[PDB]
Design a protein around this ligand. Structure first.
Ligand SMILES: NCc1ccc(C(F)(F)F)cc1
Ligand SMILES: NCc1ccc(C(F)(F)F)cc1
Length: 330
């Protein structure tokens, strides 16, 4: 079987992407943030503290005839940006774009951090990293992808994120009309539970390509591109007036500047991020200082190929027994 769903940016800056997901019987449709950097499927629900809900659509397990409480199970997650949520666990039927999984763990939030409350457009997260990162205790739970794998035509899913436009997540098949050229596959390490791979180097604008190994993770759940300080300094050195701002928390640049493109290596292939993808607009309303889409990973401890990079490519997440990542131009 296969599944296909449209994913839509939540604002004019592509800060995140939401995908409709059907949960329960009869279906309750929630708009979830598909996150290849985490492995929990959690949702705002009828059990969430009412003061922590501000416009989100909630899952109501008591209205689903297929929902079952997973006795004694709890979950608690903390994200790299400091976000967190926690609650109890139901199992229920979950469908994505026609692809249905029965008995999926649906983690019901009793408490969420303020950054989720303030994001009225995201009803929850759907984790697509490896199941070893799932936070359910005492019995760890499988991801939607892991549960669907056996019935998929091919054990893959693909991410085709749009620049200021809708995109597509496909499960079980590779749409050969959605990219140009060939797909370049590269090895994945699962030792930390992430879709972790090694880029072969980078170039700034029309400069020379620098061959150098950059270990990082493919993370649809992270907005920006986080790279080592040496790389990020070399990029922003080419933007007149750009500087690292401690008060803002990263590199900013004059909004009137034109940004150079950024190229990253995948094996012998090259993925080019247009300079316009790196503009995240004014730091505050009316400001003439703009926030950059490429920032240093020094404080994070790991390099993150977030949406800024992934949306320049057609990305194949191959969940075969030896997992691989595929990149194509589009
Ligand atoms: N998108 C989920 C996520 C969040 C944080 C991290 C970090 F910061 F720990 F690397 C990885 C993945
Ligand atoms: N990387 C996972 C993640 C995704 C979204 C959010 C936000 F923006 F909704 F708070 C936080 C963390």
């Amino acid at each position: 079987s296969t599944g296909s769903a449209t994913t839509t940016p939540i604002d004019s800056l592509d800060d995140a992407y939401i995908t409709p997901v059907q949960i329960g019987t009869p279906a309750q449709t929630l708009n979830l943030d598909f996150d290849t950097g985490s492995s929990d499927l959690w949702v705002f629900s009828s059990e969430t503290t009412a003061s922590e809900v501000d416009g989100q659509t909630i899952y109501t397990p008591s209205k689903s005839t297929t929902a079952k409480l997973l006795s004694g199970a709890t979950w608690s997650i903390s994200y790299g940006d400091g976000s967190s949520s926690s609650g109890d666990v139901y199992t229920d039927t979950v469908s994505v774009g026609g692809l249905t999984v029965t008995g999926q763990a649906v983690e019901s939030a009793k408490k969420v951090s303020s950054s989720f409350t303030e994001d009225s457009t995201i009803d929850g997260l759907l984790g697509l990293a490896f199941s070893t990162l799932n936070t359910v205790s005492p019995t760890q739970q499988k991801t939607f992808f892991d549960n669907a794998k056996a019935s998929l035509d091919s054990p893959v899913f693909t991410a085709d994120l749009g620049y200021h436009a809708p995109g597509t997540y496909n499960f079980g098949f590779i749409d050969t009309t959605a990219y140009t050229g060939s797909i370049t596959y590269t090895a994945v390490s699962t030792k930390q539970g992430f879709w972790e791979w090694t880029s072969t180097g980078y170039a700034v604008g029309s400069g020379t390509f620098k061959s150098t190994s950059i270990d990082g993770i493919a993370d649809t759940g992270t907005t920006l591109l986080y790279l080592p300080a040496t790389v990020v300094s070399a990029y922003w050195a080419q933007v007149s007036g750009a500087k690292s701002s401690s008060s803002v928390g990263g590199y900013v640049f004059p909004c009137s500047a034109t940004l150079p493109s950024f190229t990253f290596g995948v094996g012998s292939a090259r993925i080019v991020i247009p300079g316009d993808y790196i503009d995240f607009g004014p730091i505050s309303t009316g400001s003439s200082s703009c926030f950059g889409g490429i920032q240093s990973s020094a404080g994070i401890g790991i390099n993150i190929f977030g949406d800024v990079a992934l949306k320049a490519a057609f990305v194949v997440f191959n969940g075969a027994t030896t997992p691989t990542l595929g990149f194509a131009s589009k």
